[PDB]
């Protein structure tokens, strides 16, 4: 059904199995997305206890199918076109002057729920760096996610740099290299070059004692 | 290769990873299938000791590619057409007045062997019901497995009700809801409505000390009128 699966509010489940410098953890998120307005509303729990990395470093890894593509750009939405069978999303994330994340996720419908299941491996992080030292502010900047077609692989590639505010007023950069490929065998919409423009708020549930992240996000496509 | 993979006798491996009301168990079966006559000959062993559920309730979960499709119905054999890459088979099984099984299996060739790997989760069973209370006879009835095309998923659906004999002369019903989808991305046979008609005998191997089941099964497709040009 592709884009037809996103005409209303869709329940979301996200699971991340993580290992950073040997620190293993598991994050589960639940909530809902509404692609007609480009909005996500999610709560994440670290079920394994205190997260060994800052929550903001996990935001990009933790469902671009919920981006709002305006009417004139609907035919450049690879993400929805791959549904319900879904797509594989792979990243390498280079934290400047620090370690790297490598991720692999499957994003697909399981029944009426959109599910993002992720494995993340992090290596070479510095003990007193901004990441293991938890020096990053609990907030998130606006970015442009640049998307281009990958015809040879019937999918897309994306490139962008995330800017993490540091507590001392500096910025921690994280270069993202991304590849998406369809899981199913029905055709997809290999887009012209464009980008997603993102906005994100991070907050807390004041009644939640577990280590957790409430996230609100709005994303719209542009550049065509 | 498809149908061509089933012209002779084919070795089978079956593995079931199970959990029913918290009872973990594991079953491995080996044997062979002969699709030209629709015959399975298999022996199953539990590696986890005595099963928490009766052997007969696991029979349908434990390779419909070995069904005999008569020559005039060969164009309706979805199961063999997905081979060797294989198919995913998913069911929900509702035991009347009792619990439910949910199963996901991949059926495919691994080398020369047809392999069925299954995950089973059972929930909401009654402690002294026919299943957890082991009140089902060690036998198996004849059924019609009703198959229909699922064009939107390039696969099939099946509906049927299994009748388990209970030791007091009553019957324990289990409503099966089934979906199959190809693993590969190549064309498959999508059938007209038809059914599989089944017969099964359950026995023991007198030399086997583990909890186990020997199974012999004959299945033949039917419900489509004979035509000389196999239309």
Nearest C-alpha in B relative to A185: B185
Nearest C-alpha in B relative to A85: B153
The answer to whether A5 and A107 have CB atoms below 8 angstroms apart is no
Q: Mutation target for B interface from A4, A5, A181, A185: give the one with most B CBs within 10 A.
A: A185
Nearest C-alpha in A relative to B186: A185
Nearest C-alpha in A relative to B152: A1
Which residues neighbour A207 within 8 Å (Cβ) at sequence distance 6 or greater? none
CA-based nearest distance B152→chain A, Å: 9
Q: How far apart are CA A43 and CA A30, in angstroms?
A: 6
Does a cis peptide bond (omega within 30 degrees of 0) precede residue A84? Answer: yes
The answer to whether A202 and A55 have CB atoms below 8 angstroms apart is yes
Q: Mutation target for A interface from B183, B185, B186: give the one with most A CBs within 10 A.
A: B185
DSSP conformation class of B52: S
The answer to whether B116 and B215 have CB atoms below 8 angstroms apart is no
Query: What's chain A look like in SS3?
Result: CHHHHHCCCEEEEEEEEEEECCEEEEEEEEEEEECCCCEEEEEEEECCCCCCCCHHHHCCCCCHHHCECCHHHHHHCHHHHCCCCCEEEEEEEEECCCCEEEEEEEEEEECCEEEEEEEEEEECCCCCCCCCCCCECCCCCCCEEEEEEEHHHCEEEEEEEEEEEECCCCEEEEEEEEEEEECCCCCCCCCCCEEEEEEEEEECCCCCCCCEEEEEEEEEEECC
Number of A/B CB contacts below 8 angstroms equals: 3
CA-based nearest distance B90→chain A, Å: 13
In terms of Cβ atoms closer than 10 Å to its own Cβ (0-12, 13-18, 19+), residue B30 is middle
CATH architecture of A1-224: Beta Barrel (2.40)
Resolution of the determined structure in angstroms stands at 2.0
CA-based nearest distance B111→chain A, Å: 24
> B213: helix, coil or strand?
strand
Q: How far apart are CA B214 and CA B141, in angstroms?
A: 16
Nearest C-alpha in A relative to B185: A185
Chain B residues with beta carbon closer than 8 angstroms to that of A184: 185
Domain at B1-231: CATH code: 2.40.155.10
Does a cis peptide bond (omega within 30 degrees of 0) precede residue B84? Answer: yes
CA-based nearest distance A108→chain B, Å: 15
Q: How far apart are CA B116 and CA A103, in angstroms?
A: 30
Q: How far apart are CA A164 and CA A141, in angstroms?
A: 7
Chain A residues with beta carbon closer than 8 angstroms to that of B185: 184-185
Interface of B with A (CB under 8 A): 154, 185
The answer to whether B175 and B12 have CB atoms below 8 angstroms apart is no
CA-based nearest distance A4→chain B, Å: 14
- Domain limits, chain B: 1-231
> B113: helix, coil or strand?
strand
Question: By C-alpha distance, which of B120, B99, B180 is closest to B145?
Answer: B180
Q: Mutation target for B interface from A2, A5, A184, A188: give the one with most B CBs within 10 A.
A: A184
Distance set, CA B183 to CA B2, B3, B110, B115 (Å): 13, 16, 14, 14
Chain B residues with beta carbon closer than 8 angstroms to that of A185: 154, 185
Nearest C-alpha in A relative to B181: A184
CA-based nearest distance B158→chain A, Å: 18
Rounded to 5 degrees, φ, ψ at A81 are: -65, -25
């Amino acid at each position: 059904k592709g884009e037809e699966l996103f005409t209303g509010v869709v329940p979301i489940l996200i699971e991340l199995d993580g290992d950073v410098n040997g620190h293993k953890f598991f994050v589960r998120g639940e909530g809902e997305g509404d692609a007609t307005i480009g909005k996500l509303s999610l709560k994440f729990i670290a079920t394994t206890g205190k997260l060994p990395v800052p929550w903001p470093t996990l935001v990009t890894t933790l469902v671009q199918a919920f981006s709002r593509y305006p009417d004139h750009m609907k035919r450049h939405d690879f993400f929805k076109s791959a549904m319900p069978e879904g797509y594989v999303q792979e990243r390498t994330i280079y934290f400047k002057d620090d370690g790297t994340y490598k991720t692999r996720a499957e994003v697909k419908f399981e029944g009426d729920t959109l599910v993002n299941r992720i494995e993340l491996k992090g290596i070479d992080f510095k003990e007193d760096g901004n990441i293991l030292g938890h020096k990053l502010e609990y907030n998130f900047n606006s970015h442009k996610v640049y998307i281009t077609a990958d015809k040879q692989n019937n999918g897309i590639k994306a490139n962008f740099t995330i800017r993490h505010n540091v507590e001392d007023g500096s910025v921690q950069l994280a270069d993202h290299y991304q590849q998406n490929t369809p899981i199913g065998c029905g055709p997809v919409d290999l887009p012209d070059d464009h980008y997603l423009s993102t906005q994100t708020i991070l907050s807390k549930d004041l009644n939640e004692k577990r280590d957790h992240m409430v996230l609100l996000e709005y994303v719209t496509a542009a550049g065509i």
